[PDB]
Point group: C5
Chain length 221, copies 5
């Protein structure tokens, strides 16, 4: 057992564009359970440097939980084994029409401060020879989202990934997000949100389809 076919095509398409998240070569595969205990040991050190009482039955289990978050939960997208099982249906229908999946739940983490990014993604495409399974779009968005991210990079990764799998450039990706390092810290902007949009094919070059997406982006319920 290794990786997957669709995971490989996406990975190589992204490396070819320099869109991979800053990752150094694996070298050796240390035990997953050892990684957690070492990170937990390092977080125990951090908390003691901040004058926190680890003798308390609540702050005691915290280093274990931060470690379990880093390795098995929030950064699961760095491992291509967690890549969704892509299912493409043959365009028997000759669908020359558009599909838009709006308000996709996007949960990420800013690579600059390891703080939460709450977002919504809108993906639209025009089927060429294949129609992707609906949930797979939500799963691709979430795969790249669960990584230490940069919103502009993230938007591109999702675009190129969908472009590769569908064999069409006619894909559009928009991510409307709130970065908590902007909101709950620093400038403390309680009302601002960032939208980063990547247009491809007809959504870019042709004037027509460019305005067909951009207007239908930003929806509430």
């Amino acid at each position: 057992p290794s990786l997957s076919k669709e995971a490989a095509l996406v990975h190589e398409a992204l490396v070819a564009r320099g869109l991979e998240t800053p990752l150094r070569p694996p070298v050796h595969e240390m035990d997953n359970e050892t990684r957690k205990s070492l990170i937990a040991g390092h977080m125990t050190e951090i908390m003691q440097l901040l004058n926190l009482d680890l003798a308390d039955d609540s702050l005691m289990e915290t280093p274990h939980r931060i470690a379990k978050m880093y390795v098995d939960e929030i950064f699961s997208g760095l491992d291509y084994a967690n890549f969704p099982k892509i299912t493409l249906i043959e365009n028997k229908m000759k669908v020359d029409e558009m599909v838009t999946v709006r308000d996709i739940t996007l949960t990420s983490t800013c690579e600059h401060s390891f703080v939460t990014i709450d977002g919504k993604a809108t993906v639209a495409y025009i089927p060429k020879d294949s129609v992707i399974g609906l949930s797979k779009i939500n799963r691709i968005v979430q795969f790249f989202a669960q990584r230490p991210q940069v919103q502009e990079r993230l938007t591109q990764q999702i675009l190129i990934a969908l472009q590769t799998l569908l064999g069409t450039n006619n894909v559009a990706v928009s991510i409307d997000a709130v970065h908590y390092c902007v909101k709950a810290r620093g400038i403390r902007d309680a009302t601002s949100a960032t939208t980063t949009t990547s247009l491809g094919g007809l959504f870019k070059s042709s004037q027509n389809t460019r305005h067909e997406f951009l207007r239908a982006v930003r929806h509430h319920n």
Copy 2:
């Protein structure tokens, strides 16, 4: 007593495009109440395999209800005898005007998992030689919706159906829908929805009428 003229034209039109829902030869005719008792019998087996007590006063009538649902209710659009009796008014008013029927109640079932699809349809057309009865648009939408469906196929079926009966390519169909196999299971995206839009004639080729529909797409109340 057999079928209907309008139902025949639509059927032939969809078959010619490869849009007729995956159906195998119906060579024989087994009694309607026999198919319900057999499906009920098969559902009684499924429930026993799930460790559910069928001796309970409410779980007891469940296999008969799922049987009655599949045969007489939710999949009624598989039978062209249930096709709406279309009324066409002759356009002696000669109007080159646009009619849009939005927020059409659409109740379907995903063919991939037999789970609920809650949706809303938007149909727009420019009358040529005939004006269709308003309710028949709502009924056509629902006829094709009461089938094990794929959202992209459903949209095209309603388009081609309305294009055939009205004798114009000038028809636009958009379906906004929530798939419960996406929302209440799997990826569990509580916020996402999918819009599939089929543009034909002036709504497709001509630049003007394309943005006339797409802007008036998705309205709330």
Copy 3:
């Protein structure tokens, strides 16, 4: 005492287009109070054929009310004597700019089943040599609405009526409506509404003024 000047120009402009609601020649003039008693008598028979107790102090006055409604109230627009007294001010200001009267209360009745149509109208025009009085637009919409109507014909009757009175083709009429024969009966579509738009002049031919109206159509409060 006969009819009106403005009523005549409109009537003949609509007859020349085949837009006047399908009516047969009146031949003789039958007493208005006799037509009520006749209709009331026919409704008393309909109610009897439905097992209703006419000896009841409430259902007793119902035939009289439905008679009063059909002759003096809801169908008053079939009588051109009820046509609004139109007043036009000369364009001394040389106004080559637009006027839009949105959310006009439209109360009609479907010709198909004599059931209530609840609508809202949006009328826009560009004054040429005359500016029409504001309430006269509301009254024109209501004159043609108080008739057994078809939404597509209703929209056109308002359009041509306004076009004739203003001496310009630069008029746009849009009616957004809920038909209770679609909502509270048959298909029972609780959420759907129908929008019928008739564009004229620059709102039709010219690309610019076309999307000036259509965008500012469908407003809530």
Copy 4:
């Protein structure tokens, strides 16, 4: 002491287009308090002819109030001495940007029935050689509004006045209003509102700037 420079340019610009009363030779006449006493006297007569008890301590002061209203309050826009003191800042910013002042409180009276007009104005312009003081746009709208008005004329007066003061044709004025002579009387349309828009310069001729304004027109809060 007489008038003002800014009041004079606007006055003649409007007279030149038939939007204002031409300046006639300086007469002289009544004392402002004699005008009120005479109007109050005529209102006392009107109320007597309507069988109202003027001996009651409430309806007693009504003729005096309607008199004060007509002379000093609601029609103060008829006297150019009440014209706002306009301040123009030299554009050595040299900016080719656009300024939009929306939802400007507009309180008028229809000249047809002396009944209240509740409106909201939206003004946009592109600075050429000068930038007008913000509040002055609101004050100009209110100057022309406090008069017996016609919505279409009111829109043109504000347009030309702003065009003259700014030395640019690049101004757009839009008034969204509810006439109470349409709402609380006659047709009794409780839902309608009228929008009258005047476009000049690039907001008219150029297709680009035309849709820049008209889209950002009609905002709530």
Copy 5:
């Protein structure tokens, strides 16, 4: 130590366009704390001339607070030492697509009357060779907001500043604001709001990108 590189490049770019004051001080080295006591002394005199009792435990500390506000807080943007530490990420991604930061908290002051301006800023740009850090856009808007401003000037100061740092003309700035010198005094317009928009590069010249921003401007939550 004294200033910043990115601060100097922006200052220079603004002086070159007449949007800033030529940096000429050090003044006669007035101690930060003596400027406060002198301003507090001048405000004590103003309050005395308005006949307010300074012996009251509440009004006593007011001159000190207004001084502290003027010197250390609300006018902090007049000193380029307070300019944010800009971070530019190299465009490794070759991203030819857009970033929009909407609903930016903007807190300013009427240069005309020293009164509060409550605003929201919307900044958009297409990254050329650099991607600026998200919070920096918020921080730049607030730097220029924290000084006695003129909204049309503020909008441009932000545009040019971002155009300079990013090395692109493709930047769009829109400020939506409520001036309390218009709302709570004078004309007393409780509902008006002023939007000032500055479009550069593709957002101005090219017709596509101009309508991509202006449509996505003015968002609530």
